[PDB]
Amino acid sequence: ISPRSLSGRIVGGVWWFFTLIIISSYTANLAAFLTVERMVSPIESAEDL
Amino acid sequence: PKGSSLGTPVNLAVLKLSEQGLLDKLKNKWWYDKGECGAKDSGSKEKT
């Protein structure tokens, strides 16, 4: 966010694309676990119990 | 064999070994103790 920088543009371009992929994957995984309700079984084994 | 002297004593000894735990102990000894795959389920980490 400072004036015009030839290098700052590529930094904020790669960074913007990176954070875009990150937030997209976050939303996608959140929908994946609000849609897929798979009952996880805790500590079935006796030794871990 | 039918009518053998060892029939009933072995029939009782099997139950005696099962109730004592020696049968399960031998099972674990020759299956898991000598088993090549030692990590078994205690170290699998139960990925979740």
Swiss-Prot record, chain A:
Residue intervals on the Cytoplasmic side: 1-5
Tissue: Detected in forebrain. Detected in dendrites of neuronal cells. Expressed in the pyramidal cell layers of CA1 and CA3 and in the granule cell layer of the dentate gyrus.
Source organism superkingdom: Eukaryota
Subcellular location: Cell membrane; Postsynaptic cell membrane; Postsynaptic density membrane
Posttranslational modification: Palmitoylated. Depalmitoylated upon L-glutamate stimulation.
Quaternary state and interactors: Homotetramer or heterotetramer of pore-forming glutamate receptor subunits. Tetramers may be formed by the dimerization of dimers. May interact with MPP4. Forms a ternary complex with GRIP1 and CSPG4. Interacts with ATAD1 in an ATP-dependent manner. ATAD1-catalyzed ATP hydrolysis disrupts binding to ATAD1 and to GRIP1 and leads to AMPAR complex disassembly. Interacts with GRIP2. Interacts with GRIP1. Interacts with NSF via its C-terminus. Interacts with CACNG2, PICK1 and GRIP2. Interacts with GRIA1 and SYNDIG1. Part of a complex containing GRIA2, NSF and NAPA and/or NAPB.
Listed name of the protein: Glutamate receptor 2
Included range, full protein: 612 to 660 of 883
UniProtKB/Swiss-Prot annotation, chain B:
Highest taxon listed in the record's lineage: Eukaryota
Induction of expression: Down-regulated in the pyramidal cell layer of CA1 in the hippocampus by global ischemia.
Summary of the tissues where the protein is detected: Detected in forebrain. Detected in dendrites of neuronal cells. Expressed in the pyramidal cell layers of CA1 and CA3 and in the granule cell layer of the dentate gyrus.
Changes after translation: Palmitoylated. Depalmitoylated upon L-glutamate stimulation. Ubiquitinated by RNF167, leading to its degradation.
Compartment(s) of residence: Cell membrane; Postsynaptic cell membrane; Postsynaptic density membrane
Site (Interaction with the cone snail toxin Con-ikot-ikot): K16
Family per similarity comment: Belongs to the glutamate-gated ion channel (TC 1.A.10.1) family. GRIA2 subfamily.
Domain topic, free-text comment: The M4 transmembrane segment mediates tetramerization and is required for cell surface expression.
Additional detail: The postsynaptic actions of L-glutamate are mediated by a variety of receptors that are named according to their selective agonists. This receptor binds AMPA (quisqualate) > L-glutamate > kainate.
Subunit structure: Homotetramer or heterotetramer of pore-forming glutamate receptor subunits. Tetramers may be formed by the dimerization of dimers. May interact with MPP4. Forms a ternary complex with GRIP1 and CSPG4. Interacts with ATAD1 in an ATP-dependent manner. ATAD1-catalyzed ATP hydrolysis disrupts binding to ATAD1 and to GRIP1 and leads to AMPAR complex disassembly. Interacts with GRIP2. Interacts with GRIP1. Interacts with NSF via its C-terminus. Interacts with CACNG2, PICK1 and GRIP2. Interacts with GRIA1 and SYNDIG1. Part of a complex containing GRIA2, NSF and NAPA and/or NAPB.
Function text: Ionotropic glutamate receptor that functions as a ligand-gated cation channel, gated by L-glutamate and glutamatergic agonists such as alpha-amino-3-hydroxy-5-methyl-4-isoxazolepropionic acid (AMPA), quisqualic acid, and kainic acid. L-glutamate acts as an excitatory neurotransmitter at many synapses in the central nervous system and plays an important role in fast excitatory synaptic transmission.
Name of this protein: Glutamate receptor 2
